[PDB]
From a paper:
A family of flavin-containing ene-reductases (EREDs) named old yellow enzymes (OYEs) have been studied for close to a century, yet continue to surprise with its versatile activities. Typically, OYEs reduce activated alkenes asymmetrically following a bi-bi ping-pong mechanism, in which a reduced nicotinamide cofactor reduces the flavin followed by a flavin hydride attack on the substrate’s β-carbon with a local tyrosine as a proton donor. OYEs are classified into several classes: class I are from plants, cyano-, actino-, and proteobacteria, class II are the classical OYEs from fungi, and class III are similar to class I species but are thermophilic-like OYEs, and so far classes IV–VI are less defined.
A new structure of OYE2 was solved at a resolution of 1.5 Å resolution, higher than the previously published 2.45 Å,40 and molecular docking was performed with 7a. Semiflexible dockings were performed whereby 7a was allowed to sample various conformations, with the condition that only the side chains of amino acids lining the active site of the OYEs were allowed to move (semi-induced fit). 7a was docked into OYE2 with the β-carbonyl hydrogen bonded to the Asn-His pair, and the carbonyls in a cis configuration. The benzene ring of 7a is in an edge-to-face position relative to both FMN and F297. The dihedral angle between the two carbonyl groups in OYE2 is only ca. 18°, which would suggest a high energy conformation for 7a. This could, however, be mediated by the hydrogen bonding of the β-carbonyl group to the Asn-His pair. Alternatively, if 7a were to adopt a lower potential energy by rotation of the intercarbonyl bond, this would place the α-carbonyl oxygen closer to the N5 of FMN.
Author numbering: 2 to 394
Amino acid sequence: PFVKDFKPQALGDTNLFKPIKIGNNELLHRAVIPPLTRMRAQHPGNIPNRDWAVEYYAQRAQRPGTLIITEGTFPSPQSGGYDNAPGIWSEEQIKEWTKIFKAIHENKSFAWVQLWVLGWAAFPDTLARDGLRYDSASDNVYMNAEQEEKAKKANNPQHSITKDEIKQYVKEYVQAAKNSIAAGADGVEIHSANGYLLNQFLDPHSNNRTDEYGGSIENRARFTLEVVDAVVDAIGPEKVGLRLSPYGVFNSMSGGAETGIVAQYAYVLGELERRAKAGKRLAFVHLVEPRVTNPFLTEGEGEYNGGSNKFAYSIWKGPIIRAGNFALHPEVVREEVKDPRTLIGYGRFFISNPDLVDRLEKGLPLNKYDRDTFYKMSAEGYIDYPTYEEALK
Ligand SMILES: Cc1cc2nc3c(=O)[nH]c(=O)nc-3n(C[C@H](O)[C@H](O)[C@H](O)COP(=O)(O)O)c2cc1C
């Protein structure tokens, strides 16, 4: 069951096992569950899975004081376009989320909803079935030839969203954030990473707009910062986080090939620190490491060695969550958690190790993960990974 080419290291003696306050939540350790889409939500409805989702989250909440960031969750139908990712717009969805949050809170852990808006990564034929637009920054740059063929075959060509449609998305983020908090979530994370709609605005490849949402660093950051401002004004800065992937190439983003990419992200972080100095500091910034430029590639592939997220620490002075290939690299974690405001997100190995925090504390072998069940409508590879003690039996 265990990864064979990995020699574990106990991290119990590091800042990974020191408490830290994040927003309203007193974490007992700094191992974070990053958002992990599992495609078990039910359709019609985009309902969090009524058989399994509670169990899945409860298992991973088992170490008290754990911050859990939910899978990407759609604020509205128009935000979506994947049938088996959950939403948080409807009473049927909110009923299931409430049970999830209850389960996480019964284990004295924390639940943060990631708010996800797809843009050009949506399936345009699924959107067309539901009478929805296929939305992005650009009126003419497609994510790839496959997306362009699907959009044209469905007569659902990519729509460059207008100012009024941007404002509607901001209102949907706000309402979805309020639904999250009312249902019991500890906070929300705004997904501005991995090539989805807000990242499509930030990135100069995807954004060739000629209005105030494109054509400059400041203009490409506008949508992301309007969402952050609206959600912070609605629910409070202590209940809001942001996720960015400066070096990501997933979903046809530029990454380090774009020489202006660090300036673009530096500007976003500077504007967050400016808000913080005005009394509105976000709970955290969540950065994907250049260790993982594409989460569809195996650990050690799609590594970008040309850049680092260290710049972020000179600009943003709040908590930073870093994710990307850390589970198999405790020697890297031991160095990175020397910084007293650094938390570590563990994605793939939290899929396969519900007791990952115990295993990092004590230096236990890790369960291998089964990539074939990352996105399958199955309990198998979802709620049937064993704890270390179960694995030894
Ligand atoms: C199956 C899977 C689903 C993911 N879903 C999401 C998602 O919903 N939102 C998001 O921001 N990142 C998502 N990611 C990216 C992870 O949060 C993480 O940044 C990435 O897996 C790298 O960390 P790791 O090496 O520890 O797995 C996903 C990754 C995987 C493998």
